[PDB]
Amino acid sequence: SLLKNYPPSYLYPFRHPKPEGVIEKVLFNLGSLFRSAGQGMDELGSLMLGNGGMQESVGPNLAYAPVKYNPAAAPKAGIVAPIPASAQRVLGVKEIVLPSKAESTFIAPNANVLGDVKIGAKSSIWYGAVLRGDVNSIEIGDNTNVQDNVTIHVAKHSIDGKLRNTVIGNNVTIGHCATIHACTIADNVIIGMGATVLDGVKVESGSIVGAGSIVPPNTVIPAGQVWVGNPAKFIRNVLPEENGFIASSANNYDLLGQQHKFENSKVFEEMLVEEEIAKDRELLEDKNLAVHQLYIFDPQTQLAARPR
């Protein structure tokens, strides 16, 4: 950048460096006193507030969260990991199953992905989606989009041997608020928003399941057909162009997932710095300011780039 004399408070807004001047040191000590008094007043107020005291704490990260490992039933989709020794002498669990995801995969912080979940590259798990692999494995293929508030569930195979794992193929779109229990979905399928897919349902490639449609258990939706309804029934065959739509939706949501992953993955200090970037961008919109005569500022980071 052009200048190197920028104030340290300007360069490090998240945390100012250690006070060096006498006045700064006195301000630091006064801030310490204020912090302690404020916490005391907070606790006194919390006493009157009653049970709970309106206390707040950081929440656990459930996007990458474990499940109890079963020695009888080995993991199928996810990886198994040891736990810290102190937690071993407290909890007594030897190993815990953890989800397995590729680097390109985007999982929202809100989303809860649990245990036996394998997610492929370029796939996206969006906000509010709950993926529980506690009893049986969940497999999601590449470029597959589990949208907002989608619930994917599994069950145990049981005596019959009926497969109760959930296998989702590549280029599959699961619409918002859809509920998928232990079913199998082939490649290039759109599941409509609100659609319920129950046990034993095999949806063949190229098919579309309509919005708000409940497909009955043990029903095979054949390839290239559109099925809608509360007792989901066939209405029409997929048009040739609608297939290109299916692929286009998958790819568009891949790009969308890349963007959302980029935004969410920034650290706090960078987020606060970017907030200040936006703010002084707004303040610098006036081009008759004295400083604008002095310098031309870089657009992405409003730092002096060259003199005017």
């Binding site: 950081v58 996007a63 919005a211 309804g229």
Partner: protein, 250 residues
């Protein structure tokens, strides 16, 4: 991965979800060049997520679990319109009809829990029932009600003053004068009162930051905390990217 032409710049440090030890989800956040706008009296629940080009008018209430994603196209929610729990409002890039694909919600519109709206025009004083799906290009005219568990197919219309129900949503009955005049508005006013209540017991910076500050202070005391000039690093990364893009032969 890294968007080098992003409005605020490239990301100097990106952290993986495995490395997160606490939930960092933001209730309002910016997706590249698209910025959500909110009024003073707009209530967004801590669970709720609002991203992209979403414009929240006065007295808009976004309750717990609702996701309003304005990534593909613009979402506008009118005055005193409430998005209830776990209800998803999203916008498509294009609509099948050929009209604008923005998701425009009128005033005094109640979207009941788990209802999905995508690229639809919802008129003033409308109710979308629970688990009701309104697809792309579907237009609900003002003072109309969609019953719970009903689907409006793409490019379909619900006329004013009518109650519609069914998976292929069909006409059921004409809404009465009392209903259209009072009850539809009254439901939105009730949920505004509930959201006003939730806002009144919310602190500006609730005491959950203390836990992360404890870790940061521990790092400071043990001298692992590093001071990074993110602004300068963003500038340098963009310069290097431009130089490399000039150098490349293919």
């Amino acid at each position: 991965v890294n968007f080098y032409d992003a409005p605020n710049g490239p990301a100097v440090e990106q952290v993986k979800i495995e490395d997160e030890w606490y939930n960092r989800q933001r209730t309002e956040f910016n997706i590249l060049n698209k910025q959500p706008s909110k009024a003073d009296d707009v209530f967004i629940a801590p669970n709720a997520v609002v991203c992209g080009d979403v414009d929240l008018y006065q007295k808009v209430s976004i309750f717990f679990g609702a996701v309003v994603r304005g990534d593909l196209n613009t979402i506008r929610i009118g005055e005193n319109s409430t998005i209830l729990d776990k209800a998803v409002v999203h916008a498509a890039s294009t609509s099948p009809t050929g009209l604008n694909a923005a998701t425009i919600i009128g005033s005094n519109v109640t979207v009941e829990p788990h209802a999905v709206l995508r690229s639809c025009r919802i008129g003033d004083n409308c109710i979308v029932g629970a688990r009701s799906v309104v697809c792309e290009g579907a237009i609900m005219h003002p003072e109309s009600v969609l019953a719970p568990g009903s689907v409006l197919a793409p490019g379909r219309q619900i006329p004013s003053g009518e109650l519609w129900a069914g998976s292929p949503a069909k006409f059921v009955r004409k809404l009465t004068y009392y209903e259209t005049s009072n009850v539809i508005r009254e439901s939105a006013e009730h949920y505004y009162d509930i959201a006003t209540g939730f806002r009144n017991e919310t602190f500006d910076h609730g005491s959950a930051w203390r836990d992360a500050e404890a870790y940061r202070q521990k790092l400071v005391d043990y001298k692992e905390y590093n001071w990074v000039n993110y602004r300068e690093q963003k500038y340098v990364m963009r310069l290097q990217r431009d130089a490399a893009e000039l150098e490349k032969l293919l």
